[PDB]
């Protein structure tokens with residue numbers, strides 16, 4: 362099991378001012394550390410944050426968190442469930458900032474909610490340095506859905522943080538699961554009359570202002586003031602990243618359909634789905650390490666059945682293992698790192714998750 366630690370710096374808080382924290386399972390004699398960012402949408406104004414606080418409160422507060430958590434999938438310590446990194450030090454960072462891990466704005470007389478996701482990550486890293494992370498060889502910052510996009514937004518800041526603190530030996534890497542989305546499937550990109558039908562790019566624009574959100578510096582310098590929302594989209598922020606990042610992305614992500622307002626399928630829907638898979642495949646063509654199955658699904662890496670999905674005969678744990686080998690101080694025979702399905706329809710891959 363992973364054991365809860367609430368941050369000693371109680372000024373780095375969840376949305377409601379309760380302390381943020383992390384679940385930790387130490388593995389003495391391992392110099393590999395996996396920090397997993399939980400996902401779970403976001404809120405972007407007072408009214409829909411209030412709604413989230415009423416019926417999704419564990420995503421906004423630590424008050425009701427359990428003392429322990431069971432590590433599953435890539436967080437499992439059993440080699441059967443986790444052929445990749447079962448012996449690693451395991452950290453699960455709960456998502457309680459509702460800001461796609463981008464916020465740097467505390468509560469006050471003007472802010473009723475605190476949005477500190479980017480600061481929570483930095484504070485967890487700081488505390489872990491005193492619990493063995495100072496001796497690490499690899500820190501893998503992983504995450505699913507909003508946590509996957511969180512990886513893209515934060516992996517280079519963790520690398521810079523560890524360099525400035527005097528730990529240049531730790532190799533910081535990223536693993537972004539279901540965090541890679543397209544912004545091009547919209548009739549209107551700026552209308553936001555209600556929360557549910559708000560355009561995805563407009564929701565992010567509003568969120569960034571509400572959260573005092575921060576994006577990676579090289580990406581921010583490209584798109585400049587007011588256009589930081591661009592850096593939430595993988596194909597725009599990825600080329601600016603210096604840290605190695607492995608991208609896990611279903612070709613037909615259920616959250617992509619949701620932000621596109623897409624729910625016997627006829628020609629219009631068939632063309633949308635087939636074009637979506639082709640466009641996602643195209644955006645991944647120059648990502649060196651990726652795993653992108655032709656499935657309609659959402660998230661994978663902390664699901665116990667993540668061992669079972671295969672692309673071109675290679676499982677996700679094996680792909681990550683080959684990625685590890687590729688980064689040890691020319692492709693590898695029988696150990697591929699770039700695995701993107703070419704077939705054009707959900708479940709054309711027979712290993713897709715069911716239900």
Ligand SMILES: *[C@@H]1O[C@H](CO)[C@@H](O)[C@H](O)[C@H]1NC(C)=O
Nearest residue numbers: 369370371372373480483484
């Ligand atoms: C707590 O975190 C805040 C935000 O990063 C920082 O400004 C402050 O110096 C920290 N204080 C301590 C005691 O760690």
Ligand SMILES: CN1CCC[C@H]1c1cccnc1
Nearest residue numbers: 506507510542561562565616
């Ligand atoms: C960051 N989120 C994860 C799942 C969907 C993604 C997203 C991207 C852009 C606008 N809203 C949500």
